[PDB]
Amino acid sequence: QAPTAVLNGNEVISGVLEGKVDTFKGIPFADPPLNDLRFKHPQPFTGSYQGLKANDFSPACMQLDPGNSLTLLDKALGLAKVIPEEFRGPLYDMAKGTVSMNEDCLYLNVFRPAGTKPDAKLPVMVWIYGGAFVYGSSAAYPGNSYVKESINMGQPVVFVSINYRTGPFGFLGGDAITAEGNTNAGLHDQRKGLEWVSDNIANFGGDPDKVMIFGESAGAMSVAHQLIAYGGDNTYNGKKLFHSAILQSGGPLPYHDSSSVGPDISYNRFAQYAGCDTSASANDTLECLRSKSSSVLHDAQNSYDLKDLFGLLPQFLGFGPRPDGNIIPDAAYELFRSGRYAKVPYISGNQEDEGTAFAPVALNATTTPHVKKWLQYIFYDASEASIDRVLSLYPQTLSVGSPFRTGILNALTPQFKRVAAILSDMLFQSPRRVMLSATKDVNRWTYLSTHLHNLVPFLGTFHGNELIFQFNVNIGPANSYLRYFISFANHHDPNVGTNLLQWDQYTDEGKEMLEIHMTDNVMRTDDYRIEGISNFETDVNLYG
Numbered sequence: 095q096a097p098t099a100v101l102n103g104n105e106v107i108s109g110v111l112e113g114k115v116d117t118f119k120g121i122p123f124a125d126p127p128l129n130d131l132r133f134k135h136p137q138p139f140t141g142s143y144q145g146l147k148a149n150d151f152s153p154a155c156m157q158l159d160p161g162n163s164l165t166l167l168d169k170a171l172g173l174a175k176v177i178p179e180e181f182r183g184p185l186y187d188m189a190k191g192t193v194s195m196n197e198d199c200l201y202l203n204v205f206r207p208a209g210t211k212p213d214a215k216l217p218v219m220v221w222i223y224g225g226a227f228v229y230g231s232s233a234a235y236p237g238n239s240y241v242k243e244s245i246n247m248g249q250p251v252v253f254v255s256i257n258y259r260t261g262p263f264g265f266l267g268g269d270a271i272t273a274e275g276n277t278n279a280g281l282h283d284q285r286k287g288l289e290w291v292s293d294n295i296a297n298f299g300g301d302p303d304k305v306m307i308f309g310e311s312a313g314a315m316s317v318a319h320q321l322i323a324y325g326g327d328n329t330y331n332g333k334k335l336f337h338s339a340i341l342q343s344g345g346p347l348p349y350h351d352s353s354s355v356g357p358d359i360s361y362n363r364f365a366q367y368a369g370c371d372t373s374a375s376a377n378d379t380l381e382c383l384r385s386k387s388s389s390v391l392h393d394a395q396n397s398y399d400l401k402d403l404f405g406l407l408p409q410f411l412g413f414g415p416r417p418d419g420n421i422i423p424d425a426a427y428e429l430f431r432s433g434r435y436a437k438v439p440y441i442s443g444n445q446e447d448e449g450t451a452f453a454p455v456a457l458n459a460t461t462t463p464h465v466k467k468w469l470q471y472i473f474y475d476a477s478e479a480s481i482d483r484v485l486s487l488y489p490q491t492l493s494v495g496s497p498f499r500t501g502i503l504n505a506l507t508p509q510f511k512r513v514a515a516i517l518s519d520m521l522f523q524s525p526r527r528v529m530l531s532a533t534k535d536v537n538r539w540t541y542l543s544t545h546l547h548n549l550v551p552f553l554g555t556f557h558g559n560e561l562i563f564q565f566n567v568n569i570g571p572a573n574s575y576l577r578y579f580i581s582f583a584n585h586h587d588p589n590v591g592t593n594l595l596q597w598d599q600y601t602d603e604g605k606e607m608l609e610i611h612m613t614d615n616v617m618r619t620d621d622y623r624i625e626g627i628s629n630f631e632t633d634v635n636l637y638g
């Protein structure tokens with residue numbers, strides 16, 4: 095029997111019973127962003143839900159193939175040699191998929207315990223993806239393991255995943271988009287999905303007054319931008335859109351302006367790869383981009399990734415959230431430090447070796463001059479003095495680079511461990527500490543995951559790896575990532591009924607941090623590489 099829910103008082107949608115979980119997949123929350131609506135803010139859904147058979151995932155939004163990155167990594171270090179088969183199988187499974195990709199992709203999915211009734215008021219967990227090596231948008235993140243575990247725990251939740259536009263489709267900047275007021279469209283997509291949840295989740299048995307948003311990599315960077323959206327106003331028609339958050343390996347971005355990697359403006363490069371004439375006026379280039387087929391814009395996006403992000407650099411360094419004076423009113427770091435953020439409790443953490451999967455971009459660097467040149471490209475407006483100070487704080491000494499704590503092993507090149515440490519701390523660890531020290535009036539918890547230490551040559555406990563334990567095979571540290579986060583969605587404290595180590599909250603006095611291992615966890619403090627990370631937190635002259 096198909097489970098049902100009724101929206102707008104009388105429109106009945108049906109889902110699919112999958113074991114003991116009811117699923118409703120492919121629910122539209124905005125009108126399709128096609129033709130004249132390409133690159134514009136999401137428009138209200140003007141259709142009908144009546145008779146919708148929400149029985150399969152919608153198309154994924156336009157994105158790059160993970161194969162680009164996985165093949166470069168494989169060329170650089172031989173993934174089948176370094177990653178144990180039990181983790182490698184899952185990792186490649188999340189990088190492929192049966193869903194198509196299409197610009198018509200603004201849909202969400204609801205997962206709940208079978209037989210939940212609309213009056214149940216179950217806590218809601220809303221997942222926002224952003225995995226560097228994952229294909230499929232929400233289709234790669236089924237909520238069944240989270241829902242099944244919350245039932246076993248006696249703490250049932252509703253899980254929701256939302257699609258949003260990434261890349262140039264969701265974050266095309268430039269003067270024409272600014273003049274239209276259509277900046278940061280992908281962030282507005284997420285916010286519209288959250289409005290849909292506030293208005294409609296009670297019909298599925300969820301509680302609109304207890305919503306947790308969480309995500310990983312660009313999804314955690316998105317959650318951090320939702321916390322400072324409109325200077326911390328997370329209300330919609332008087333109601334708070336979310337009440338707690340978890341950020342897995344991502345935080346605010348250090349930009350104070352719409353900058354991107356390298357010597358050229360990202361808009362200009364993409365327009366050029368799409369075959370538009372970049373000497374025409376701003377409005378004419380945007381009109382040209384709105385006339386191209388999706389395959390042409392897809393090839394153009396692929397060329398920007400391979401040529402300008404070198405197939406590996408985090409996508410938000412090219413097309414991503416930037417200050418626009420409206421949904422992001424000022425630089426993200428400054429909004430957190432002036433208290434202009436939503437006052438909700440959160441968990442923020444990192445994998446030990448966040449930078450190792452990105453370090454192969456600088457594989458040809460053997461000397462400090464070579465590393466300086468790569469850093470001058472990625473951070474093109476950085477002052478030379480600021481770069482020189484980073485290079486003195488992160489030396490080429492093999493034992494202090496990343497994979498961390500591995501001595502003289504894993505030195506793929508003379509500079510690989512150094513570049514992996516710099517990218518780790520600049521892009522992931524410093525953003526986490528900017529939030530933890532700025533948000534002193536909310537409860538917060540932080541973690542370091544070291545569970546693959548010494549099991550994966552050259553990569554260590556790398557960026558994006560923990561997603562296989564949350565969404566694919568529930569082995570290794572899966573119980574920590576499932577149960578602490580279910581407890582947090584229910585009680586805004588990770589320690590209720592987990593049967594796991596007590597995780598003490600982070601305080602400014604003790605800087606308490608959970609360290610997650612393969613089978614056990616231990617408490618530690620967030621005390622490592624203080625000088626190096628602190629400099630990234632405070633040197634504004636690095637960023638552009």
Ligand SMILES: *[C@@H]1O[C@H](CO)[C@@H](O[C@@H]2O[C@H](CO)[C@@H](O)[C@H](O)[C@H]2NC(C)=O)[C@H](O)[C@H]1NC(C)=O
Binds near residue numbers: 459460464471
């Ligand atoms: C490492 O590779 C990069 C990318 O090919 C080289 O940098 C380029 O060098 C040419 C000539 O100086 C410039 O026109 C490019 O614009 C540079 N691009 C970047 C991203 O820096 C770099 O010279 C190589 N380093 C070594 C030691 O060979």
Ligand SMILES: *[C@@H]1O[C@H](CO)[C@@H](O)[C@H](O)[C@H]1NC(C)=O
Binds near residue numbers: 270273274377
């Ligand atoms: C460009 O488009 C904007 C927003 O649609 C409009 O207000 C402006 O007049 C246009 N300007 C030119 C020079 O075409």
Ligand SMILES: *[C@H]1O[C@H](CO)[C@@H](O)[C@H](O)[C@H]1NC(C)=O
Binds near residue numbers: 096100
């Ligand atoms: C939709 O139909 C099912 C019967 O399969 C029923 O249990 C459910 O209550 C209906 N939905 C609502 C919200 O009435």
